[PDB]
Amino acid sequence: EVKLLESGGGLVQPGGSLKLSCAASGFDFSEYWMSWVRQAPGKGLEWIGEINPDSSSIDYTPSLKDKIIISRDNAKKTLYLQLSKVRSEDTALYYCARPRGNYVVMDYWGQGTSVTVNIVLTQSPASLAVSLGQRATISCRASESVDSYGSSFVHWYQQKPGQPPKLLIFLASKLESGVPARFSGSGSRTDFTLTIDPVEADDAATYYCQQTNEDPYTFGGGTKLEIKR
């Protein structure tokens, strides 16, 4: 399991150049490319930019590309994203993440930090609450193909408010490493279906279904599950 550190979320001056430091501890960007994603409060996450494994070509955001530039060092394993003409709407929560395709254990996003200066899928049921020891099925309908290049290309990531996001299931064939979640895609899955058995108190989070089959991998509305006491 790789380790990602992202701390120092604080307010910034109006219009000043703000930088967020993200560290890939115990690893390097040479093996897996690092990508930053921008998410707002009560809104889906959007890819703020991507990098290359060899640190050759770096991608940018689909909404505000030229407004932010991210520089990363693989040998130092440290990434900093600077910006110009930062506004109130531009001060979104930028979180780094390691590449999910390298490994399930390597599919560990950063801690994430917020400052105060895509994939179209519908996940149901929006509200879920079951006791410990129960099984629940969540279905996310999508408009694109159910499976891209034979196997499925849909992922579900369970993120909590104030906690680091974790990718529960990836491509319906490789679930989360370290802690194997029972919820994973199976069958034909015209709607991406995940059956969790059992849920726990630590699993009280919103699982957003991002369809990696449709470029790019962006979290949708998601489905929130809790732990009934």
Binding site: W33, D54, Y149, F153
Partner: peptide, 10 residues
């Protein structure tokens, strides 16, 4: 590594 061809063989 940086191609977008997915490479479906897991």
């Amino acid at each position: 590594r940086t191609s977008d061809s997915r490479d479906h063989t897991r």
